[PDB]
Structures are given as structure tokens and as C-alpha cells.
């Protein structure tokens, strides 16, 4: 049972559109479903789709495969689970975004990891995410034979979504309801959702604005010496004390935000403190799996060679 296998290996449930889209791709190319969109869109299905693909099967147990790292790009936060890849020149990729390991994805996000850390919303299911990508591709293609192929995939995609009841919109009602719960955008822009009660307990803002925090981070990276770097780091050390205060007052979202911003900034100079902030924040929020993902990822934060099944 590949479905049980994929959810066991990632320790995450997958939504029904994940499995329906596999079937859709099997229909497009029965022999190599994960590559059904490679020629027309330049996209390949990977990650949990590798499991559906049976790519993991040839290896003999114990393989040592770690799904926490599998197709995890450099700026993928633990919430983001890659399912589609494009060109490695930009490291374009799409992933399911989950606010909690115990909840189904709230949308499909996209990022170009060689460009920046920003995660853009691209529909709430993979049919929508591919439809929206295809629509953009339609504006760039200059060969009527290739346009014909894209129109055919578009027609099949739209009909499948209609029968299954999936919205093709970039932002759905459900996504707008989730974004109401966002307490801060973070550096990746995709939003952080943590519980906030009636008395406002659960989150507090960082004592620096995002722009000033980036200024501080840049000073750490640009520092000419260890002593210079220590002085530049001082505001971040102070913010970690403020996070300790917040944790004592149950405002666990603050440490998640600081840790996420530091991770998003991308410098290895922040891996130690990110490894203090983020596992603790996720564990306090009872999002235990995400603490394990960030521990694994910070220890092996690869720019290239993230395919555990290469």
C-alpha cells in the first residue's frame, strides 16, 4: 500500500488532491506518471510522489532515507513539503504548506530557492497549482503545436477539478480564512499561524521591525572579525532573552517568528540560535514533527543534492 507507505515515511497525512493528481498524471503518461508534465511544463513530481512512484523500492533496508530532508530546499521551512520541481537553475518548486503536522495542507506554496526565501500561495490543491503554472506558460509559448498540447492538458485539468470539486483559484475561501489567523508574515511572507486566545495570549511581536531585523542580520554577515560579529550579534542575543520572557508568559509564537526569520535570512551564522529557537517553539506549540524537521535540516542545510533517492 503505497499510500500508507508515503504517509508513514513522511509522518504526515496527505490530502485527497495529492492522490487524485497522481491518477491524473497516470492518465497522461501511464508509464512515467511523475514525468507527465516534464516536456510541456518543465515540471516533475517528486517528494511524496517519489514514494507513489516506487523509486524508494530498489534500495535495501535499512536505506537510511530521511524524508525530512528529501527535496527540502534551502529555504523550505518545516511547514513546506516539496511535491513538484522545475528548473534547478532557479530551484523553482511547489510544496504543500501545513501550519500544523496534525492538519492537512492549507495551500500549495512556491519558491525559487536560488532567488530568495519568499513563498507564494498558488492555490489550495495541486490541480490549481498546476493550472495556474500552465496559464503562465501559455503566455510564453510561441509554437502552435505546443499551445495545442497545453490547451489539452488545461482542458483535462479543469474537467478533473470540476468533477472532484477542487477550486482552481489562486486564493480560495478556505485560504482567506486561514490568512485571517496569521499573526505575522515572517521573512518568507507565507504567514505564521499560532493560537491566540481572548486575552491575546499566544504571540507577541518582535522588538524590531522586519526591516530593522534584516539590517541587524546584515551587520552580522558583513562583520569583518569575530569580535565585530559578536558586537553585531548583540541585538539578536537580546531578542533571545525577550523570547525567553515571552515563553514564560505562554506567547510561544514570538520565538517561532524570530527563529523563522533567522532561518529565512539564510546565513549559517544563525544556525546555532535558530536551532535553539525553533525546536523549542515547535515543541511548546505541540508541533513536534516540525522540531525534528528543523533539527535535521539545520544539521544538513544543503544548497544542492537534496534528492535522497538520486
Numbering used by the authors: 36 to 345
From the paper:
A previously uncharacterized protein, C4orf27, was demonstrated to be a cofactor of PARP1. It has been well established that HPF1 binding to PARP1 restricts hyper-automodification of PARP123,26.
To answer these questions, we determined the crystal structures of mouse and human HPF1, and human HPF1/PARP1 complex at 1.71 Å, 1.57 Å, and 1.98 Å resolution, respectively.
